[PDB]
Amino acid sequence: MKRVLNLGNLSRIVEGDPNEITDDEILVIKDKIIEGKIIDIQKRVDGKLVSLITEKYT
Amino acid sequence: MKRVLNLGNLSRIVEGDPNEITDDEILVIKDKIIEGKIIDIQKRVDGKLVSLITEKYT
Amino acid sequence: YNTFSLKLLEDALYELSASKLAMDDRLFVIKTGERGAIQFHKEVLKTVSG
Numbered sequence: 001m002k003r004v005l006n007l008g009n010l011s012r013i014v015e016g017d018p019n020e021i022t023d024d025e026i027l028v029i030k031d032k033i034i035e036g037k038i039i040d041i042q043k044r045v046d047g048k049l050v051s052l053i054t055e056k057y058t
Numbered sequence: 059m060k061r062v063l064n065l066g067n068l069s070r071i072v073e074g075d076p077n078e079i080t081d082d083e084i085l086v087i088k089d090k091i092i093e094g095k096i097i098d099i100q101k102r103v104d105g106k107l108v109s110l111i112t113e114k115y116t
Numbered sequence: 117y118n119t120f121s122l123k124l125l126e127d128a129l130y131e132l133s134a135s136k137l138a139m140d141d142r143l144f145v146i147k148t149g150e151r152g153a154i155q156f157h158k159e160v161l162k163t164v165s166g
Contacts, residue, residue: 003073007069010065054091
């Protein structure tokens with residue numbers, strides 16, 4: 001057990017508009033219908049804002 | 059575009075044992091199949107680990 | 117020991133110290149090779165990392 005990233009790279013975990021998320025920062029999309037849950041973690045790669053969570057099916 | 063949470067609560071995002079993380083820590087799990095993905099993010103609710111990301115269905 | 121742990125070491129030394137030594141005279145000094153000092157360093161770092 002140890003920390004996952006230096007706090008410098010964790011201070012750039014933000015909550016905002018997908019259109020203003022550049023690199024050197026990760027995006028979190030909070031859920032509305034559910035209070036504490038999250039919807040997706042996102043990271044831009046080539047202008048597109050892709051997810052870091054692998055899709056899981058039945 | 060504020061940080062999703064403060065640093066005292068982001069500092070406690072860690073990587074490792076699911077058994078050793080307290081209620082104050084968020085657990086990350088790096089996907090082993092893919093090289094830069096995530097498979098789950100967990101924090102202790104009632105002594106049990108539960109995914110923060112909302113479950114998706116079709 | 118099979119695997120080294122600051123847990124195991126801290127317990128043994130304290131139990132010894134409680135039974136045998138005053139609070140003021142529990143300064144211990146271990147003798148090792150360079151590798152034991154490294155193994156110590158790694159474990160100490162693993163803890164503060166927790």
